[PDB]
């Protein structure tokens, strides 16, 4: 069962156990608002 | 946050572009217009005027 269909044996987890995730959300985050502050000002160091 | 900001400068950005609009239009039909009218010839040069 754990090989196949791992939904039900396996319970809810946090996201922080997943590798990168986090970080990966919070990079996403941090360009939507650096877009939205840049266009009313508020200079701020590009993410990319 | 940063989806209101967007609003906000869409917002000015369309203030804007309506206000250049009008003032172009004002602008142009203004010049026009004085060129149109002006000096005209008076009493004595002409009866005419």
């Keep these: 069962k754990l ?4 939904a039900s044996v396996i319970g809810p987890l946090a996201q922080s156990m997943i590798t990168g995730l986090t970080g990966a959300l919070g990079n996403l985050n941090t360009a939507i608002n650096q877009i939205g502050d840049v266009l009313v000002g508020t200079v701020v160091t590009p993410i990319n | 946050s940063a989806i209101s900001n967007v609003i906000d400068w869409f917002n000015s950005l369309l203030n804007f572009q309506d206000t250049t609009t009008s003032n172009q239009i004002n ?4 010049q026009i ?3 149109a009218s002006g000096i005209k010839k008076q009493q004595w ?3 005419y005027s």
């Design chain 1, 3 to 6: 090989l196949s269909d791992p």
């Design chain 2, 27 to 30: 602008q142009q039909n203004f």
């Design chain 2, 33 to 35: 217009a004085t060129l």
């Design chain 2, 45 to 47: 040069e002409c009866r």
